[PDB]
Amino acid sequence: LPTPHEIRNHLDDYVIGQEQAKKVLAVAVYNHYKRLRNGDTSNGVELGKSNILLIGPTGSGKTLLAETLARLLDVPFTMADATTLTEAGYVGEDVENIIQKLLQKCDYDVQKAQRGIVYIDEIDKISRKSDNPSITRDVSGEGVQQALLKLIEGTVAAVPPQQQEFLQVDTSKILFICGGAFAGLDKVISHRVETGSGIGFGATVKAKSDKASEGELLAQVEPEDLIKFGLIPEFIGRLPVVATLNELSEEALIQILKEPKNALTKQYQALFNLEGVDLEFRDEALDAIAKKAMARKTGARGLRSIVEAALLDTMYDLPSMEDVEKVVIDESVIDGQSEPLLIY
Amino acid sequence: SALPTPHEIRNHLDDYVIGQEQAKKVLAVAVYNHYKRLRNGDTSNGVELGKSNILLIGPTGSGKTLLAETLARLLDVPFTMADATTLTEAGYVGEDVENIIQKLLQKCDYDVQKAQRGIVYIDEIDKISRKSDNPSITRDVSGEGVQQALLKLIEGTVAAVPPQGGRKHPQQEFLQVDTSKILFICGGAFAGLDKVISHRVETGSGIGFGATVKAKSDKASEGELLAQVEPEDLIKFGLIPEFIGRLPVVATLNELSEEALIQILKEPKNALTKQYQALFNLEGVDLEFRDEALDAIAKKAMARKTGARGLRSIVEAALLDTMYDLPSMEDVEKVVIDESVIDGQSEPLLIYG
């Protein structure tokens, strides 16, 4: 019987920050459990479902939230690509593949599948760039969206085996969570509340808002902006809950190095201990690597590349070296000007 | 037999649907006629009674799908719901048009006789429409192809429904089902149809000095255009002329106004406000919505342009913080939400008892 606070604490153990989005997923999961426990509600009232939509830059942890949250979930869970889907009548993979994919973790059971949770990533890619029907029916941006319109609410869909039974499974009680890096969307929101004046004299010129981070603009996202981005109004309606993330800053990246349980620093420490050596990272060293990552715009994913190169030489001669007790990493080795300290 | 009269059946529909009078009467008349034709199965009189398919056109969140669900409850005949997007032209991986009848058989317990007198609802019918360049120099299977295959099925034909799908899989005598008495109701939100209607009813002019109409920006809303819908406009949208003909009666909805949203919040049997109240009751805390608060959410929902679905996001966002801390906090017996909480200027009010 987990509660919103309990779910929040468990999620914070793996991913830090993103408090705004953490409350959205925690409350949604708690509400889902209550509905599953009591469907009729003993009052003749049918409880609906509220789908979520995640809008954040790449490397912000959108997929990390679903993976970590999946462990706590006690119901079947699955992930989707959103890029391999195709409209009915075309090669590839129909949208129905999401439902059957969930059955993989539910031992192919309809009863348990109806109470599962489905998460789709990379939803931004499936969007009509032209914002209107093209000369030929799009099979990746518009075709997939139309099929998903009716698949997000009820619409009992067949489940092709793995021979033609096509067992029916209800999708009315299956919560749907969406998420994707809507590239360029930040500009759509800005243009809506950026300028509303003319050019020549006699115009109510308005001062442009000071430089605002991408996270601030996304915080003001509304369905109108999504429509102009290439999302049909029907699809937006299916996703009432809207949450946005914030780009990681210098302080956020430094925290991700130690605070997370599965942080890259902890993983490397255990790796060295496997062969019989201990590794430690100085506070200054962590700050240097974090700053370098943002300089190259590589993001959070780059933290693993910088550290790998810095310790590449040490790991080459680490197991071969004998009579070694500890390894010290400072700020002078991040830039490569000084060889990492080693004691015997 | 005690066949429900159109007025009685319409009253039940009002319980789950609000702000819809033209569509409720059309559906009530067609369903009532369906029962009458069932009694006269042998058509004692020389003249044989036919069927009149319906077509629903309206914006998103207008109650097109909700009407089919609520009506299916009263319909004693097997009722089925199908998606036009999944359907494709025959001979392809996508589901064929014959699958519609297959699903109906399951609802009737493999009873072919009962399948003859049935009602189907092809939701998202507007999806299968000729896109730009109606001629379609290329072969279209998920668009015009579906409409062509639906010409004989909607009008009525003997389709050899496969005997699989929950029954004996091996090859056997394919069941013969006649769709000459199945009332087909197509419903979908034809996006962009309003623009085509305006180009016809509303006269347009270019640039000039005399005999030119400026046509100021402030004109009739798109709702009025949808009301005066002509089959010619539908053909220009992408529907083949032979397809629109199968649907003689066409009922159009109207965009929900501010007053309509308020009624939908309480009057419906399963309303948005009542759903949240029950959710809070499970943990042991009551929920109440002030009259002024309902007005604020309704007004803010209209600007969303997402139909009735907008109310779901407005109430969820306002109560996002309430539900996140309510279970953790104890000694809570009720929550009061006023107008000052909808706009977010003041946090939700709570009383400890």
Ligand SMILES: Nc1ncnc2c1ncn2[C@@H]1O[C@H](COP(=O)(O)OP(=O)(O)OP(O)(O)=S)[C@@H](O)[C@H]1O
């Ligand atoms: N806030 C964060 N805290 C800790 N680690 C993070 C965070 N954000 C990203 N990471 C790390 O970055 C890795 C990849 O990030 P993702 O979860 O893929 O974010 P993403 O934006 O969803 O990527 P996509 O889906 O390809 S756009 C994760 O496995 C984490 O190790």
Ligand SMILES: Nc1ncnc2c1ncn2[C@@H]1O[C@H](COP(=O)(O)OP(=O)(O)OP(O)(O)=S)[C@@H](O)[C@H]1O
């Ligand atoms: N007339 C109405 N009365 C009460 N609730 C309504 C009404 N219209 C819409 N709703 C609400 O909106 C929800 C969605 O209804 P739908 O009919 O499925 O929307 P829709 O218009 O069918 O979407 P499209 O256009 O088919 S994609 C319902 O479950 C109700 O909660």
Ligand SMILES: [Mg+2]
């Ligand atoms: Mg991802």
Ligand SMILES: [Mg+2]
């Ligand atoms: Mg619908």
